[PDB]
Design an enzyme around this catalytic site. Structure first.
Site, PDB file in Angstrom:
ATOM      1  N   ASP A  79       0.850  -1.172   0.000  1.00  0.00           N
ATOM      2  CA  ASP A  79       0.000   0.000   0.000  1.00  0.00           C
ATOM      3  C   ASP A  79       0.902   1.244   0.000  1.00  0.00           C
ATOM      4  OD1 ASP A  79      -2.294   1.639   0.368  1.00  0.00           O
ATOM      5  OD2 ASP A  79      -1.823   1.666   2.526  1.00  0.00           O
ATOM      6  N   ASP A  92      -0.150   5.272   0.562  1.00  0.00           N
ATOM      7  CA  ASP A  92      -0.419   6.273   1.599  1.00  0.00           C
ATOM      8  C   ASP A  92      -0.539   5.658   2.985  1.00  0.00           C
ATOM      9  OD1 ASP A  92      -0.265   8.433  -0.043  1.00  0.00           O
ATOM     10  OD2 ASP A  92      -2.433   8.760  -0.203  1.00  0.00           O
TER      11      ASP A  92
HETATM   12 MG   LIG Z   1      -3.457   3.355   2.870  1.00  0.00          MG
END
Ligand SMILES: [Mg+2]
Ligand code: VN3
Ligand SMILES: [Mg+2]
Lengths: 252, 252
Positions: free
Chosen positions: B6, B8
């Site tokens: 992932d 962010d």
């Molecule tokens: Mg995230």
């Protein structure tokens, strides 16, 4: 006698046309009775309807006069002379960002939406949506029903004013239908003619209009507001009724 | 070993920077360990971060491969081949209009909003908002809180799927991080390398990613989902700890 009148749900039908209003409208004109649109719509919208100045746009934010108006007022717009009564749109939009920061939830208006979104929302064509988005003073808001209370407080907290147009809330500063009607009457070439004013409307944003006139008429869907007169049927058929029953007889 | 990550809150800090994850990425790169972004971002946003394919966008909606990937799959598009796993944005939008009719209530999403409004709502610059608006598979929705239930029911009634990404609701059909991961693994040039997969994420909605990999690592705040490894500290620092303790030793 000057007749000030709302457009949507007053003079215009369910699809912004006229209905029986042609009848009544053409009658007032034939008798030389000035009819003045006072609307939440923008100038572009009013122009697309074929309507001529003087007219009042965006809930009282702009008062538009013919270029050769015998009483010198406002600023030239090529074809018009404009009397700006309210803050400009860009300043309302900026102040709305502060209301939004205060409310802690999104506050969306027309300025945030594409013409496509506005068209879908209102049932208008893409083109009509672009004209409704061309705002100079007043913002049309698209609020969540349960957030309305908190949103209106945030508007007040940041120095904006609000009103309701019939389906949408509006935000502005200095825009008031009655203030605009008073200004126009004060700028009327024939003072005797302006001494008697009629007001027709159908929504919350029209209460200021009713208070600024001498004879007020509600052709909206519900019960008449404080002391205002009523008609058998709403909209353009209420308008026709008002002209035949209330106005013509007063022309003597 | 393939590392699926992932972006962010995991590989990037709260400023969108790498921080201590920079040295960790270099280390993996040096050992020839492939790292595959798996993100809710659009392809345009991923490109602005300067990331190269393969990567997975819009919550598993699309899998982007280098044009010269040794396994032939997807549709050629410039320097990519695109494997589309979800319905296209245009179709989601059409279904959203159907849902809006069913709900008798507006359903507004990024496609209805200007880049300026998206920017204001997300804290992004207008340019980054434009990239966030260039969606190919999923739509981000701006829903009224008391209207969620009815809206979500309508979305499902028209065959759409939804998730809540922490701030907004999202609508798509066929966008699933776990499925995209399983697909990429199936399309891996070296089957042996693809037999061991790592997934790192910082949120509970990374669960589909965690299920599709062999070693699952949560670097978010609070407790990880059951079955998922945790790190002492969150974000990029957790990413760093994860590489050092779980991956590096395994590569010897
Ligand atoms: Mg995230
Ligand atoms: O023309 V009106 O709905 O203020
Ligand atoms: Mg009206």
């Amino acid at each position: 006698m000057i007749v000030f009148t709302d457009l949507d749900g007053t003079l215009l039908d369910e699809r912004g046309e006229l209905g029986p209003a042609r009848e009544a409208l053409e009658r007032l004109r034939a008798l030389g009775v000035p009819v003045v649109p006072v609307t939440a719509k923008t100038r572009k919208e009013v122009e697309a309807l074929g309507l001529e100045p003087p007219f009042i746009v965006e809930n009282g934010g702009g008062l538009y006069l013919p270029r050769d108006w015998p009483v010198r007022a406002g600023r030239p717009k090529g074809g018009y002379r404009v009397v700006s009564l309210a803050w400009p749109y860009r300043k309302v939009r900026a102040r709305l960002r502060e209301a939004e920061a205060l409310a802690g939830r999104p506050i969306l208006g027309y300025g945030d939406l594409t013409a496509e979104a506005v068209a879908r929302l209102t049932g208008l064509s893409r083109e009509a949506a672009r004209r409704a988005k061309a705002r100079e003073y007043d913002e049309t808001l698209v609020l969540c029903p349960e957030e309305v209370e908190a949103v209106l407080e945030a508007l007040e907290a940041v120095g904006l004013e609000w009103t309701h147009g019939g389906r949408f809330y509006h935000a502005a500063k200095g825009a008031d239908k009655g203030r605009a009607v008073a200004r126009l009457r004060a700028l009327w070439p024939d003072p005797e003619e302006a001494r008697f004013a009629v007001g027709l409307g159908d929504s919350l944003n029209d209460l200021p209009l009713f208070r600024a006139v001498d004879l007020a008429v509600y052709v909206g869907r519900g019960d008449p507001p404080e002391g205002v007169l009523a008609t058998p049927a709403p909209g353009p058929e209420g308008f026709r009724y008002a002209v035949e029953r209330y106005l013509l007889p007063r022309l003597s």
